Design an enzyme around this catalytic site. Structure first.
Site, PDB file in Angstrom:
ATOM      1  CG  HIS A   1      16.000   1.575  11.249  1.00 43.99           C
ATOM      2  ND1 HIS A   1      15.223   1.360  12.368  1.00 43.99           N
ATOM      3  CD2 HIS A   1      15.695   2.810  10.775  1.00 43.99           C
ATOM      4  CE1 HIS A   1      14.469   2.430  12.544  1.00 43.99           C
ATOM      5  NE2 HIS A   1      14.724   3.317  11.594  1.00 43.99           N
TER       6      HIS A   1
ATOM      7  N   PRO B   1       0.829  -1.211   0.000  1.00 43.65           N
ATOM      8  CG  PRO B   1      -0.800  -1.597   1.620  1.00 43.65           C
ATOM      9  CD  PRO B   1       0.563  -2.058   1.171  1.00 43.65           C
ATOM     10  CB  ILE B   2       1.016   4.149  -2.358  1.00 41.18           C
ATOM     11  CG1 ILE B   2      -0.386   4.745  -2.432  1.00 41.18           C
ATOM     12  CG2 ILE B   2       1.312   3.233  -3.516  1.00 41.18           C
ATOM     13  CD1 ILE B   2      -0.602   5.540  -3.698  1.00 41.18           C
ATOM     14  CG  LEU B   3      -1.681   6.763   3.213  1.00 43.63           C
ATOM     15  CD1 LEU B   3      -0.570   7.751   3.442  1.00 43.63           C
ATOM     16  CD2 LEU B   3      -2.939   7.502   2.844  1.00 43.63           C
ATOM     17  N   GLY B   4       0.910   4.421   4.318  1.00 37.62           N
ATOM     18  CA  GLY B   4       1.006   3.700   5.568  1.00 37.62           C
ATOM     19  C   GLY B   4       1.046   4.632   6.762  1.00 37.62           C
TER      20      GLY B   4
ATOM     21  CG  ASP C   1       7.707   2.493   8.740  1.00 41.36           C
ATOM     22  OD1 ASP C   1       8.275   1.740   7.918  1.00 41.36           O
ATOM     23  OD2 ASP C   1       8.313   3.209   9.586  1.00 41.36           O
TER      24      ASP C   1
ATOM     25  CE1 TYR D   1      11.661   4.405  14.440  1.00 39.65           C
ATOM     26  CE2 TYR D   1       9.627   3.555  13.505  1.00 39.65           C
ATOM     27  CZ  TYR D   1      10.860   4.162  13.337  1.00 39.65           C
ATOM     28  OH  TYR D   1      11.261   4.507  12.067  1.00 39.65           O
TER      29      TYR D   1
ATOM     30  CE  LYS E   1      11.548   1.813   9.100  1.00 38.13           C
ATOM     31  NZ  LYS E   1      10.642   2.091  10.258  1.00 38.13           N
TER      32      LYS E   1
HETATM   33  N1  LIG Z   1      13.686   4.790   8.306  1.00 41.84           N
HETATM   34  C1  LIG Z   1      14.002   5.811   9.103  1.00 41.84           C
HETATM   35  O1  LIG Z   1      15.158   6.084   9.429  1.00 41.84           O
HETATM   36  C2  LIG Z   1      12.884   6.702   9.542  1.00 41.84           C
HETATM   37  C3  LIG Z   1      13.179   7.960  10.042  1.00 41.84           C
HETATM   38  C4  LIG Z   1      12.139   8.824  10.355  1.00 41.84           C
HETATM   39  C5  LIG Z   1      10.836   8.408  10.183  1.00 41.84           C
HETATM   40  N2  LIG Z   1      10.558   7.150   9.734  1.00 41.84           N
HETATM   41  C6  LIG Z   1       9.175   6.656   9.607  1.00 41.84           C
HETATM   42  O2  LIG Z   1       8.381   7.657   8.969  1.00 41.84           O
HETATM   43  C7  LIG Z   1       7.298   8.031   9.824  1.00 41.84           C
HETATM   44  C8  LIG Z   1       6.852   9.452   9.568  1.00 41.84           C
HETATM   45  O3  LIG Z   1       7.911  10.382   9.833  1.00 41.84           O
HETATM   46  P1  LIG Z   1       7.986  11.224  11.204  1.00 41.84           P
HETATM   47  O4  LIG Z   1       7.342  10.477  12.327  1.00 41.84           O
HETATM   48  O5  LIG Z   1       9.410  11.630  11.330  1.00 41.84           O
HETATM   49  O6  LIG Z   1       7.176  12.573  10.935  1.00 41.84           O
HETATM   50  P2  LIG Z   1       5.947  13.089  10.023  1.00 41.84           P
HETATM   51  O7  LIG Z   1       5.057  11.944   9.662  1.00 41.84           O
HETATM   52  O8  LIG Z   1       6.568  13.940   8.965  1.00 41.84           O
HETATM   53  O9  LIG Z   1       5.255  14.090  11.062  1.00 41.84           O
HETATM   54  C9  LIG Z   1       4.660  13.584  12.254  1.00 41.84           C
HETATM   55  C10 LIG Z   1       4.213  14.781  13.080  1.00 41.84           C
HETATM   56  O10 LIG Z   1       3.175  15.485  12.376  1.00 41.84           O
HETATM   57  C11 LIG Z   1       2.012  15.590  13.194  1.00 41.84           C
HETATM   58  N3  LIG Z   1       0.836  15.453  12.320  1.00 41.84           N
HETATM   59  C12 LIG Z   1       0.446  14.312  11.713  1.00 41.84           C
HETATM   60  N4  LIG Z   1      -0.633  14.516  10.949  1.00 41.84           N
HETATM   61  C13 LIG Z   1      -0.920  15.831  11.078  1.00 41.84           C
HETATM   62  C14 LIG Z   1      -1.925  16.630  10.543  1.00 41.84           C
HETATM   63  N5  LIG Z   1      -2.874  16.125   9.719  1.00 41.84           N
HETATM   64  N6  LIG Z   1      -1.937  17.932  10.881  1.00 41.84           N
HETATM   65  C15 LIG Z   1      -1.008  18.440  11.706  1.00 41.84           C
HETATM   66  N7  LIG Z   1      -0.023  17.735  12.258  1.00 41.84           N
HETATM   67  C16 LIG Z   1       0.008  16.426  11.933  1.00 41.84           C
HETATM   68  C17 LIG Z   1       2.159  14.486  14.227  1.00 41.84           C
HETATM   69  O11 LIG Z   1       1.451  14.831  15.409  1.00 41.84           O
HETATM   70  P3  LIG Z   1       0.592  13.773  16.279  1.00 41.84           P
HETATM   71  O12 LIG Z   1       1.203  12.417  16.097  1.00 41.84           O
HETATM   72  O13 LIG Z   1       0.740  14.326  17.686  1.00 41.84           O
HETATM   73  O14 LIG Z   1      -0.820  13.875  15.740  1.00 41.84           O
HETATM   74  C18 LIG Z   1       3.658  14.430  14.446  1.00 41.84           C
HETATM   75  O15 LIG Z   1       4.060  15.460  15.352  1.00 41.84           O
HETATM   76  C19 LIG Z   1       7.835   7.722  11.207  1.00 41.84           C
HETATM   77  O16 LIG Z   1       6.848   7.727  12.236  1.00 41.84           O
HETATM   78  C20 LIG Z   1       8.508   6.391  10.968  1.00 41.84           C
HETATM   79  O17 LIG Z   1       7.478   5.401  10.885  1.00 41.84           O
HETATM   80  C21 LIG Z   1      11.565   6.322   9.407  1.00 41.84           C
HETATM   81  C1  LIG Z   2      14.667   6.824  16.599  1.00 41.11           C
HETATM   82  C2  LIG Z   2      15.515   7.769  15.822  1.00 41.11           C
HETATM   83  N1  LIG Z   2      16.516   8.366  16.489  1.00 41.11           N
HETATM   84  C3  LIG Z   2      17.361   9.210  15.884  1.00 41.11           C
HETATM   85  C4  LIG Z   2      18.398   9.909  16.722  1.00 41.11           C
HETATM   86  C5  LIG Z   2      17.209   9.484  14.537  1.00 41.11           C
HETATM   87  C6  LIG Z   2      18.182  10.327  13.776  1.00 41.11           C
HETATM   88  C7  LIG Z   2      19.304   9.408  13.272  1.00 41.11           C
HETATM   89  N2  LIG Z   2      20.303   9.767  12.464  1.00 41.11           N
HETATM   90  C8  LIG Z   2      21.157   8.737  12.211  1.00 41.11           C
HETATM   91  C9  LIG Z   2      22.279   8.749  11.418  1.00 41.11           C
HETATM   92  F1  LIG Z   2      22.610   9.882  10.786  1.00 41.11           F
HETATM   93  C10 LIG Z   2      23.034   7.617  11.258  1.00 41.11           C
HETATM   94  F2  LIG Z   2      24.107   7.659  10.466  1.00 41.11           F
HETATM   95  C11 LIG Z   2      22.719   6.434  11.893  1.00 41.11           C
HETATM   96  C12 LIG Z   2      21.595   6.401  12.700  1.00 41.11           C
HETATM   97  F3  LIG Z   2      21.262   5.270  13.335  1.00 41.11           F
HETATM   98  C13 LIG Z   2      20.815   7.557  12.861  1.00 41.11           C
HETATM   99  S1  LIG Z   2      19.376   7.724  13.770  1.00 41.11           S
HETATM  100  C14 LIG Z   2      16.149   8.918  13.846  1.00 41.11           C
HETATM  101  C15 LIG Z   2      15.281   8.058  14.487  1.00 41.11           C
HETATM  102  C16 LIG Z   2      14.142   7.434  13.715  1.00 41.11           C
HETATM  103  C17 LIG Z   2      14.572   6.246  12.876  1.00 41.11           C
HETATM  104  O1  LIG Z   2      15.781   5.916  12.851  1.00 41.11           O
HETATM  105  O2  LIG Z   2      13.646   5.653  12.251  1.00 41.11           O
END
Ligand SMILES: NC(=O)c1ccc[n+]([C@@H]2O[C@H](COP(=O)([O-])OP(=O)(O)OC[C@H]3O[C@@H](n4cnc5c(N)ncnc54)[C@H](OP(=O)(O)O)[C@@H]3O)[C@@H](O)[C@H]2O)c1
Ligand SMILES: Cc1nc(C)c(Cc2nc3c(F)c(F)cc(F)c3s2)cc1CC(=O)O
Length: 315
Positions: free
Chosen positions: A110, A13-16, A43, A48, A77
């Site tokens: 991750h 799904p494109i939205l999660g 996700d 987390y 992850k």
């Molecule tokens: N792979 C990685 O390294 C990595 C890194 C970062 C993120 N992720 C994944 O991507 C997801 C999304 O990114 P993110 O959590 O960084 O931030 P985001 O989805 O860009 O923003 C989340 C924030 O926006 C608020 N929000 C959500 N919907 C809103 C709306 N309709 N109006 C106003 N505010 C709204 C939320 O508040 P409330 O929750 O309080 O409503 C929360 O403070 C993460 O949760 C995680 O699953 C992965």
């Molecule tokens: C849980 C969390 N903690 C931190 C502090 C970051 C920023 C991060 N930046 C970096 C980075 F540059 C690296 F090279 C390696 C890392 F593990 C991180 S974690 C992201 C997230 C969310 C998530 O990972 O999904």
């Protein structure tokens, strides 16, 4: 279309629903509401600290007969402290146990950086540098491939890999599974044109994380740009009778990306899903892309010396 085809023949799904920073005390209800209003992709990640509570919600909705397992697309992850080949299966199994699942739809490396194994998610030395592990991308990938062969996960992928790091995996003779997905930060201030082109050209699906700019990220500063409050994006939203968040979610969808906005607020969870009933114009898309500033919000200074730190490269 609501789903995109992956390299294993499965549809994603494109939205999660994102779950980083969704507190354990609040995320069970978030996931229940999300499932009720139509989300099928969640996700997750071990780091987390809320996979048990996500699992509770999924279990509840399965038992209520709201959804069946085959209809859900659950992503998790492998955290950085588990990159050693001998730690990967146990890390995956811990996630499966917490989520109360017998398989994941997608399991990601991750970050490309391996950290010293131990209890701490971010092991630091006395001077604040992350302590790396003696692990490498290719060996960690081989360990991920074993999870597919054992039936624990249906697809594997990567996250926060730059194009050279992706290339490293792609080019391995004896590669068993290509990455299905690269999950990367992507929004109007960090549009990722080059990395998206690269991944899409290689048959890798891109997932956009932090599509709303992660305003709840724990290191946000007052002078930092804010997408949700950007008056220019507000204007685009107003023209469509949609919210700025809805525009920010629709944007990556129209770039053939998967997108994973996070909320624990029930009204917002519902709002964020209502993005299949409008279209951003060619001009809207152009305008949003034009806001790129290469402003990356998701990185950590203490990791910048790691051999595999991903963001020194242009893309
Ligand atoms: N792979 C990685 O390294 C990595 C890194 C970062 C993120 N992720 C994944 O991507 C997801 C999304 O990114 P993110 O959590 O960084 O931030 P985001 O989805 O860009 O923003 C989340 C924030 O926006 C608020 N929000 C959500 N919907 C809103 C709306 N309709 N109006 C106003 N505010 C709204 C939320 O508040 P409330 O929750 O309080 O409503 C929360 O403070 C993460 O949760 C995680 O699953 C992965
Ligand atoms: C849980 C969390 N903690 C931190 C502090 C970051 C920023 C991060 N930046 C970096 C980075 F540059 C690296 F090279 C390696 C890392 F593990 C991180 S974690 C992201 C997230 C969310 C998530 O990972 O999904």
């Amino acid at each position: 279309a609501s789903r995109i085809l992956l390299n294993n023949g499965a549809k994603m799904p494109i939205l999660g629903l994102g779950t980083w920073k969704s507190p354990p005390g609040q995320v069970t209800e978030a996931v229940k509401v999300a499932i009720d209003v139509g989300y099928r992709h969640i996700d997750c990640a071990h780091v987390y600290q809320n996979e048990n509570e996500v699992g509770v919600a999924i279990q509840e909705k399965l038992r209520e007969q709201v959804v069946k397992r085959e209809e859900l697309f659950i992503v998790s992850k492998l955290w950085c402290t588990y990159h050693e080949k001998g730690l990967v299966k146990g890390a995956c199994q811990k996630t499966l146990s917490d989520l109360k699942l017998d398989y994941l739809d997608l399991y990601l490396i991750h970050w490309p950086t391996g950290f010293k194994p131990g209890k701490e998610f971010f092991p630091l030395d006395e001077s604040g540098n992350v302590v790396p592990s003696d692990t490498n991308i290719l060996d960690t990938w081989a360990a991920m491939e074993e999870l597919v062969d054992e039936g624990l996960v249906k697809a594997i992928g990567i996250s926060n890999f730059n194009h050279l790091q992706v290339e490293m995996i792609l080019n391995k003779p004896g590669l068993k599974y290509k990455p299905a997905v690269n999950q990367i930060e992507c929004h109007p201030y960090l549009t990722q044109e080059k990395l998206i082109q690269y991944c899409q050209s290689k048959g890798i699906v891109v997932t956009a994380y932090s599509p709303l700019g992660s305003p709840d990220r724990p290191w946000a500063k007052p002078e930092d740009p804010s997408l949700l409050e950007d008056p220019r994006i507000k204007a685009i939203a107003a023209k469509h009778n949609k919210t700025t968040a809805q525009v920010l979610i629709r944007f990556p969808m129209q770039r053939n990306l998967v997108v994973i906005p996070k909320s624990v607020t029930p009204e917002r969870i519902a709002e964020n899903f209502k993005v299949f009933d409008f279209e951003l114009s060619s001009q809207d898309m152009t305008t949003l892309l034009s806001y790129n500033r290469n402003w990356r919000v998701c990185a950590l200074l203490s990791c910048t010396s790691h051999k595999d730190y991903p963001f020194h490269e242009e893309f």
